[model samples]
Target: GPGGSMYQLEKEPIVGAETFYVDGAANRETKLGKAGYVTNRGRQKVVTLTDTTNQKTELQAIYLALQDSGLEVNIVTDSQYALGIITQWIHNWKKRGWKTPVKNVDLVNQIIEQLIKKEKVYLAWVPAHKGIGGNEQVDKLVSAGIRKV
Candidate 1:
């Protein structure tokens, strides 16, 4: 409710439209991260990240999805931290003048900017390792991205 008309959280992944399934992975030992997205249309992209955590990389995936050409974008992600940043925690973060230390604040702000520019953006959280096709694909891509780094 905090995000108003611009955002909606779905329990189940929305079907029958152009949607992006995004995921992120990180190796704690190396501090290497990767963000990956797979669209319903079979388009996939991955970006290798450095000096990042898993949640930060997940936010990066959502930010990258927002940059796509779709007007009403539907993004499906498995990261609850990223979902909470846009849907709930962002309000308090702003109210506090962003003075408090917030993890991945930069990327969070970037995503908010993109969300403002877009007409509509829906975010859905699906369980990981539940045999979701797009999620599984993005997970694989994220692994490949980590290997690339």
Candidate 2:
């Protein structure tokens, strides 16, 4: 079944597993956007975007994290909206025949598709601007992505 118990709120880190911290940022004025992720194992990536919203950009970060590899992954994000879209709203949208309009629907579709094929994937939310090392590092990478454009 496509809708199984494949996702969860990661309260504790799995031993010997890497966690990816993901984040996104956008300038309301310029409409420039960026998304990034940094793993606990020192791997990192960032991408720049244009004409994007905060929610969409955050979804992009989640999509990127899921696409990184086929390994069992535990992804952490600071955006509750993004988290809800994948863990909850995606199923609701499917029930509605996907006719109901959704923002960032493209990224949402890609994320759900990725989740369906994975065996062990977990997602968790953390407060932004906190002193968390992985979260802060991804935040900086998003800033750098914006600066790249």
Candidate 3:
């Protein structure tokens, strides 16, 4: 205890989780054998986000792919995304305006293009896990995707 250091202790949860499972298609005895993308909530919808290349052009390609596959963008998180990259500095970057704020305009621009059109999308801030309801679902879903990869 030199100089009265403070120790931060995690508080016990104000809520608790009751673990249980349901019967029928989602039950353990089901023939389909529920696997990845299982839920008691309801049916399933698959989303494919494939943009492997680091280049901005490739990012555009991914967007095209999603559209071509009949995917309608639902929500886009851009509050912390630094929209300045695509919105404010894209044109300047393309003109060799000397290292603008747009880090990868070719890509960021493509997404922004759609974003502005309101491409069946609502931009939201996907707050990281601090147990804020839907954010928790997102955190769980993202975690599942990570592990599945």
Candidate 4:
């Protein structure tokens, strides 16, 4: 028993289809920008960052929030760039000692690292300006947030 492998946990419920939906728009003056997300609980969060932030950084902020919740989640974003990097490129980057072959794919890697440590989180892509309700709302929120900061 001392050497036995850990048992696999059963899949958790779908968490009521909750999503941490997010978006970002870089500010006019610098690379940093505002990011925003809405929880299925009808909560809105918006913030401006100081880093060389863009839409991808925006997604990372929401991704961190999603993993921190420890609930089953489906992350919805209007950015295919962000989604693809997380789902596809991150693993190779890690295996290659966290360096890319010729490109820079960045993250709050610690934030993303949490996703691999647990299951039940997934990423999905959505087309922008297609009248997606939540996406539009977040777009407004982040846009408004940029002005305020």
| Model 2 worst lDDT run, 10 consecutive residues | 1-10
lDDT of 3 by residue, 80-113 (tens): 3432343344334345555644455565645554
Top model by TM-score, which number?
A: 2
lDDT of 1 by residue, 8-81 (tens): 44445445547999999988889898897999888888999989888888998999898873766789889987
Tens-digit lDDT string for candidate 2 (1-149): 12554454345655567788999999878889899899988888989999998888899998888889455678989999988777675446446554633577677878877876666677889888757599888888787646432
After best superposition, candidate 1 residue 136: deviation in angstroms? 0.6
What is each predicted model's overall lDDT from 0 to 1?
0.77, 0.77, 0.30, 0.61
Show the colliding residue pairs in model 2.
none
Off by over 4 Å in 3: 1-46, 49-79, 82-84, 87-104, 119-127, 145-149
TM-score of each: 0.80, 0.81, 0.35, 0.70
Off by over 4 Å in 2: 1-13, 90-101, 145-149
lDDT score for candidate 4 against the true structure: 0.61
Instruction: State each candidate's clash count.
Output: 0, 0, 0, 0
